[PDB]
Every structure is written in structure tokens, then in C-alpha cells.
Ligand binder design. Structure first.
Ligand SMILES: O=C1C[C@@H](C(=O)Nc2ccc(Cl)cn2)c2ccccc21
Ligand SMILES: O=C1C[C@@H](C(=O)Nc2ccc(Cl)cn2)c2ccccc21
Ligand code: NA
Ligand code: NA
Ligand code: NA
Ligand code: NA
Lengths: 306, 306
């Protein structure tokens, strides 16, 4: 028992981190097979970042201008190409530590682990959600660009995120591993609007199930609701509308606890309208939305990786 | 910017986890050099756990009764000994993945990362504190015993915790790597009192500094206090008394922010007496005490490991 914001074990990803330097910019790269992936803004100078012409800046660079170091050891660059907002540096050595891996584009509301890195060296690991407005609320200082997000399924690492920028509002934006930003963002040092954000309702409900499984039960009430009634309350409180697909994903947790999904919605309605009256749920005084239903079952069932 | 509950990168520890089986009990072990360390209750049957005679149970076991597996591969056991509440199984092979390491006994209020494991395979990593009453509020299911806690300093892993038990109250107890419990606990399935717990005041103050560094400033006020005055408030709200040693440890954060430690104490006093009026600090609606002053500086300065 107990419920924590748990990250995936980071070792399979730590073996893939490298340092990339171009001119006077150092950031992180991801070395899989004979390719290093990194944010294309490694080729920018401080001036360049207000409105970079990436095609023109990259034409000034040759293979030998990209310095790639894997711990103590220098890699030899034999090709470079830009795909969307990422650079792909072909090197003459396959990474001997390459895990089984996939590149995935995650949906808003899904979770992943971030391995925060500086100068190609890991500093820490934490779990977060892709917000509905395609930002992440991370922990990233200058030099963290090229840090990656990921999920693991037994022995397979699914890379979903590469860090590119901190917006002036102090939230974070980045790409998939094909270099396509999540959300409307561009790799320019400019004020950039993020959507209105919303709370990930299906995740809050998953976490309430987690709370019940752990014996935190005070918020369970005598009430039920409908999808239509609940969703009127969701709109008022800037929660994502609940769909039958979300109900179906919550099926296993409903079966484990014997609490019908709409009964748990009625509990959440009362918590939205009345607050928590200075009480806590799983150590939190807020409704938590960074656990997916899959996360709660994995944590509550002791699933492992190799 | 941003502030997250960040764990240490787990790869150096993942290479050390093994499965240990004795009779019909499987749990985790830690393989460093030619020794595997694991909870001595691996030798207990379900009956045994109400009041085990560990000396008598271990006399019935020979080297060949301890099955130790490192991934797919079986290790050969050439000796066994009990040190306090841990078993040390000498094996005929040094772990080729052994990192630079130390065994440390941490103080209450210090933090560490836990690598939660089942059947010798890592499931997840999270950060927590040793509570003042020497429990931890973890996430541990049956089979997690022998999972370990640790800190990293560049290339050196300091192992501080081995998981042994879930108390009937659903909090967690374990030992240092010499097998000495933290707190009054014994490895028996019995109701066992934990102290009165208290909030780790120096950690709350560190986190308030973290909040200021990140621009969350609403709780800063016009007031100051004294150590004696603050500590009267600490007692009322079950906070650890603040000492000049704690003030000195907070020196760097005070210098970085230009907020005198006693001025930050006056902010914390007002938050204790008035609550947070439905506001948040670094995404939390509670005062957070699982970040040490060293944690806040490391996170806010991008310190890395290798
Ligand atoms: O989280 C981060 C990443 C880094 C950042 O935003 N850098 C960057 C670099 C190029 C362009 Cl075109 C835009 N932004 C940064 C600097 C200071 C603090 C945080 C962060
Ligand atoms: O966190 C844990 C560890 C495990 C546990 O307490 N097992 C154990 C085994 C032997 C003795 Cl003498 C006492 N306790 C457990 C079982 C169920 C749920 C959680 C946990
Ligand atoms: Na970029
Ligand atoms: Na983004
Ligand atoms: Na034990
Ligand atoms: Na303990």
C-alpha cells in the first residue's frame, strides 16, 4: 500500500544520453543505433533565437562542426539532416547500449518519465503528464534541452518527448522524436500563447480509485450522476468532458473496487462543489490528475521491466 | 524553472538487483562485489512471521537453500551469515556492474530515492524522506522487500535503506545496509507503535525558498520573528524545533534570495496560523517537507552524476 508519483527506472535511457556542441551551444542528444537526435536550436547563437532561419544556419555547418561526446569518448559524425525541429547526426558507431525502442507521439493527458540531463549527464528522473494544452510542467534549467521523456513496456522504451524550450510563463514545450512540436509552439524565443488548460478528468477519477484501494474513503457519498449532469459540472470547473471511452478505460478499477464509474463521478462532483474542507486524499490537498488509469493499475499490481 | 519531486537516476542501482528465494519466499537482494544483501525474513514461512526465531530458522538452511538469480543467470552461494536483520550471501562471482558505493545510516528528515523492485526486477523510482519517527511513506506491495533507498554523489551510490515491512497502519519500515532498523521496529508481523510524527521544519523552509526562486511569492509578508517565538508556533503545529544548525544549513538559500531565515520563518508562521486560503505553492495546497536544503540547491543548480 501507499501511492507515489513513480517514474520508470531510467537506466536504459541513461545509456543513450550524449553531449552535443555546435559553436558555443552545448545541449543533450539521444544516441540510438548509429544516429544522435537533438534539438535543431543547438546551431543557434543568442542573437539567432529571436527569429532563426534554421535552413540558412544549418547550411553554414559541416559534419565536423558537430561535437558529440558519450561520457569520456568522442563520436565521429558522418552525416547530418534536419527533420522538422530535430537534427539527426549519423555517427560511425552504433550505441552498444541501445535498448529495444520505439518513437511514439503521445496524446494529451498521457504520462511519461523525464530524465533531466545537463552536458549529456543525467541529474534526475520524474513523472509528469502531457497537459491538455500540450505543455508540460517540468523542472528544466538552461542546458536541459534534448532531455527526453519516455515510457517502458517490459524491455521496450517508447520515447515520446524531447525538451526544447521554456516559455516566458515558465512551463515547458517540446517535440516528439520526429521533431514535431506538441501544441502550437515554435523554436523561437518569443512570447507564445498556450491554450486554456483543463484538468484531466479521467486521471482524477483513476486517482480517486487509487485512494479507495489504499483505504482513503471519506469522499465516497450516497449520490450518483449521469454523464450529461457530470459534464455540466466539468465545464464550470474547467475539467475535460468525460466520454464513454473514458468510462470503459476505468472499467478495471470500477470492477476491483465495486464502485460504478458514475458513482465515483458523483463523489468528484461533490469534491468540486464543496472543496476538501481541509482534508487530504493520498497525501494531497488538491485533486491530482497526473495518474492515468493504466498508471494506477500498474502501481497497484507491481508490474516490472527488463 | 519549475520544481518537481525528482529521484536520482536509477541505472547504477538497477544493475545490482537480484532475486533471492529460500523455500517458498522470493524477495529482492542487492549484489555488490561478491556479496548479496537481503532481508533475513526470506527464511520465514507464513506461520513463522508472528514470532520468528531467526537463529533457529537459519540453522536449518545451507548455502544450496538460497537461490540467487541475476536476470536470467543463477549465482553460486558459497557462504551465508546474518548481520542484525540482514542476510549476507557470499557468491563465487563479483557483480561486474558494481558501482562505487558506500553504506550510510541517514538521519531523520534526510531524503533518498527508492527503486521499488519485484522478483529482482525494477518497477519504478521515487523520492521520499525518512520521517522524524523513522517510518517512510512509500509505495510497496508484497514482494517489494529488499528494495533499496539511496543517494548519489557524482559516481558514488550511498545505500541508506533496505525495505523490510509494511506496518498495519500502512507506512513502511526498514533497515540500513548493516541490518539495523530505523526506529523501534522489529521484523515480526505484530502491531508496532511508530512515534508521534512531526513535520520537518528545515525542509518546509527550503521548499519556501524553492518557491521564491521560481516566482511563487504571495506568502512573503511584512513580518519577522525570533527562534524562540517561531518554536512556540512549531510546537503547537507539531513541527520540529528549528535550531541554529538548521539556520546555518539554510544560509545559501537565504543569500541567493536575500530573505533572512527568520523573515522566512515569519512567513511560515503566518501560513501555519492562517492556512493557504485555497491558494497553492509550487503546485501544492499543503506545506511540503520532503525537500532538504541540499535538494533545493541541487535541483535549482542542475548538478549531474556519472
Ligand atoms: O527549460 C529550459 C530550456 C532552455 C530554453 O528555453 N532554451 C531555449 C533555447 C533555444 C530556443 Cl529557440 C528557445 N529556448 C532554458 C533556459 C532557461 C531556463 C529553462 C530552460
Ligand atoms: O511493503 C510491504 C512489504 C511486505 C511485508 O510487509 N512483508 C513482511 C514480511 C515479513 C515480515 Cl516479518 C513482515 N512483513 C508487504 C506485504 C503486503 C503489502 C505491502 C508490503
Ligand atoms: Na529546436
Ligand atoms: Na510542447
Ligand atoms: Na527481515
Ligand atoms: Na524504519
Amino acid at each position: 500500500s501507499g501511492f507515489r508519483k513513480m517514474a520508470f527506472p531510467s537506466g536504459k535511457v541513461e545509456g543513450c544520453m550524449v553531449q552535443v556542441t555546435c559553436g558555443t551551444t552545448t545541449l543533450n542528444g539521444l544516441w540510438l543505433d548509429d544516429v544522435v537526435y537533438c534539438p535543431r536550436h543547438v546551431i543557434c547563437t543568442s542573437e539567432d533565437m529571436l527569429n532563426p532561419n534554421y535552413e540558412d544556419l544549418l547550411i553554414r555547418k559541416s559534419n565536423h562542426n558537430f561535437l558529440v561526446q558519450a561520457g569520456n569518448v568522442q563520436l565521429r559524425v558522418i552525416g547530418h539532416s534536419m527533420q522538422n525541429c530535430v537534427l539527426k547526426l549519423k555517427v560511425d558507431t552504433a550505441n552498444p547500449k541501445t535498448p529495444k525502442y520505439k518513437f511514439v507521439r503521445i496524446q494529451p493527458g498521457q504520462t511519461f518519465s523525464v530524465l533531466a540531463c545537463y552536458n549529456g549527464s543525467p541529474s534526475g528522473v520524474y513523472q509528469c503528464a502531457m497537459r491538455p494544452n500540450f505543455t508540460i510542467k517540468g523542472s528544466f534549467l538552461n542546458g536541459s534541452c534534448g532531455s527526453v521523456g519516455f515510457n517502458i513496456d517490459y524491455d521496450c522504451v517508447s520515447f515520446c518527448y524531447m525538451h526544447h524550450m521554456e516559455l516566458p510563463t515558465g512551463v515547458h514545450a517540446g517535440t516528439d522524436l520526429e521533431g514535431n512540436f506538441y501544441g502550437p509552439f515554435v523554436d523561437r524565443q518569443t512570447a507564445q500563447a498556450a491554450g486554456t488548460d483543463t484538468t484531466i478528468t479521467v486521471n482524477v477519477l483513476a486517482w480517486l480509485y487509487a485512494a479507495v484501494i489504499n483505504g482513503d474513503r471519506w469522499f465516497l457519498n450516497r449520490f450518483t450522476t449521469t454523464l450529461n449532469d457530470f459534464n455540466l459540472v466539468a465545464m464550470k470547473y474547467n475539467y475535460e468532458p468525460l466520454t464513454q471511452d473514458h468510462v470503459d478505460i476505468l472499467g478495471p478499477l470500477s470492477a476491483q473496487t465495486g464502485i460504478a464509474v458514475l458513482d465515483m463521478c458523483a463523489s468528484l462532483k461533490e469534491l468540486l462543489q464543496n472543496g476538501m474542507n481541509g482534508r487530504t486524499i493520498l497525501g494531497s490537498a488538491l485533486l491530482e490528475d497526473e495518474f492515468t488509469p493504466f498508471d494506477v493499475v500498474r502501481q497497484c499490481s507491481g508490474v516490472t521491466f527488463q
